[PDB]
Amino acid sequence: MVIKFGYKASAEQFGPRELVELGVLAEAHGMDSATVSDHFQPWRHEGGHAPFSLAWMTAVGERTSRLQLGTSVMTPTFRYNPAVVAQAFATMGCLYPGRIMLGVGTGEALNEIATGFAGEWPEFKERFARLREAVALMRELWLGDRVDFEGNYYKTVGASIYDVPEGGIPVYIAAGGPVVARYAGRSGDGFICTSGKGMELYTEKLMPAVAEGAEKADRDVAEIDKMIEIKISYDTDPELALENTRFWAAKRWIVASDPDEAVAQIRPYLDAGLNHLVFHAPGHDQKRFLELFQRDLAPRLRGL
Amino acid sequence: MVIKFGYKASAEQFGPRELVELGVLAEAHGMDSATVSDHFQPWRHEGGHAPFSLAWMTAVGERTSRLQLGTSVMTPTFRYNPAVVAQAFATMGCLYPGRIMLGVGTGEALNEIATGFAGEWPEFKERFARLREAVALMRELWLGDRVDFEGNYYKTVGASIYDVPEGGIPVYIAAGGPVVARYAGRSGDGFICTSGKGMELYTEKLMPAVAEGAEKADRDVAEIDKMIEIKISYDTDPELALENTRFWAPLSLPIEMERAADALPIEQVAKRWIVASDPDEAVAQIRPYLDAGLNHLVFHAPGHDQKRFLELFQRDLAPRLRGL
């Protein structure tokens, strides 16, 4: 897939209007994508906010014309009905053709417990199985009609979605290990991972797992968009570059005031075959980040 | 509450982009509000749609500046988690200050069975108990800090919503009878009913019930917005005024059902619609709802050419209504 640079909006750090305006500024400053995590719980310590992700996506969508928008990620398996998730994303894709994706993961307990999940949090195998089932259900609604989906967890009866782009909505699967990454290679339209683990995670585990799955499924691996969230504090002021990380309380972060050093720290992800770099910055001044990214980092990255 | 005229956008009848553009046109043509029904299933097979209500509300909100937006109605009790509903509406309320409401009903089986609801469909008492519980949970979230809610149906654990307007989000309750109307008087920021059902429903059952609930809760009934969906087929062409009801024929009585609807005589289809081609006659048929004390009239027009309805409404009907 082609090289793309995007922006991760931090839902824990900003209220709804500011978050939306940052997504719009992301397009203004040349980003190819903007994504948001689907949190419910606002954590006082992570900044005290949690704007609803689908409202953010839609508001930014209606204000923009090029930018790809999605979740990174949302858990479609516990506090949501997967059928309704499919409806929401199908509608958004109609509203913003060719610019919507659905990024999904296997789930975090604390948000689900907060919203009323009953009993013991399922183990990884059940969480993963639920995710594959929900993905299939949603795609069946997108592609078919009068769907009677009867899974081990989820169900529909005569369900239809007419208001959907042809072929449905790209689904991006997040993975932090090879088991789910192989699933991404078999079944995802995209793959999402996070930076700042040793580089061997990407080059020995996750990218080979995606390629394996794509082989097993008889697909061309190049058609899978390979997204990485890169945590980066960049500022030309050396003190502000460092001080911006104090909101976030191998190295997990790139912390840099020199744009060539920053680019050097990003390059290894591109060399590992991640093509869709999504930048997540800690400072309160996100407008400055977007301006500095466009001015200093993007031209150097395209120059590689 | 002050008189307002708004627009019912038909999710049943238009796909997502067209529905959004109609919402925006409602504001351009002077409407005070626009609402949408929240269904999952396309309303009918032939020409049916179901765009996701919350995406419509947000996209119209981002395109507008004055219009009040809301659901009329959504069921927050079966395929939605009420805490997530509360989050969604609180976010929208922050995005569009003073312009968002949550309109809720007790629900209908077809949409829930479609989306996986298991077992016997609850009777009215249980659907209504679930609704009241969901509303209470949402309000606790909006107005509280770290909420531990545990009801018969719904639960939260240490849950918070901090991105919410002061005072929360207005909740409007759909009422077809006195029991729910009294609850709207006690607890609703508004109530919603639909026209065409015989004037005694509004004057003898629903309005007095809202007033009684308000008095029992020590509220001023004037603070409750009294909304009615006015089913009106206005067109200066009398053939269109009648024939534009056709899409809605399923209301006037499975693939057989729809064949049966398409074959209904148009007079039968049009029975509970105001059909008018003269603007004074139209207004005469609207006026009894104002006289009954409904203050927020949301006009629902049946035909495919909704831009023409909005232009006609602004030209012919709004000035006459303001003149009452």
Residue numbers in the entry:
A (entry chain B): 1 to 249, 280 to 334
B (entry chain A): 1 to 253, 264 to 334
Article, verbatim:
In mycobacteria and other actinomycetes, glucose-6-phosphate dehydrogenases (FGDs) seem to be the main producer of F420H2, by catalyzing the reaction F420 + glucose-6-phosphate → F420H2 + 6-phosphogluconolactone. Since the identification of the first FGD two decades ago in Daniels’ lab, only two FGDs from actinomycetes, namely M. smegmatis and Mtb, have been characterized in detail. These two FGDs share 37% sequence similarity and belong to an F420-dependent enzyme subgroup within the luciferase-like hydride transferase family. Rh-FGD1 is strictly dependent on F420 as coenzyme. Rh-FGD1 was also found to be highly specific for G6P as electron donor.
We have focused our exploration on Rh-FGD1, the best expressed one, characterized the kinetic properties and elucidated the structure of the apo protein at high resolution. The asymmetric unit contains two enzyme monomers forming a compact dimer, which is also observed in solution as estimated by gel permeation analysis (data not shown), similarly to the mycobacterial homolog (1.0 Å rmsd difference for 610 pairs of Cα atoms). Each Rh-FGD1 monomer is comprised of residues 1–334, forming an (α/β)8 TIM-barrel, with the active site typically located at the C-terminus of the barrel, as observed in Mtb-FGD1. Only residues 254–263 in subunit A, and 250–279 in subunit B lack clear electron density and were therefore excluded from the final model. All attempts to elucidate the structure of Rh-FGD1 in its holoenzyme form, i.e., with the F420 cofactor bound, were unsuccessful. Nonetheless, the obtained overall structure is substantially identical to that of the F420-bound Mtb-FGD1 and the architecture of the active site is conserved. In Rh-FGD1, out of the three residues, the position of Lys258 is unknown as it is part of the disordered region.
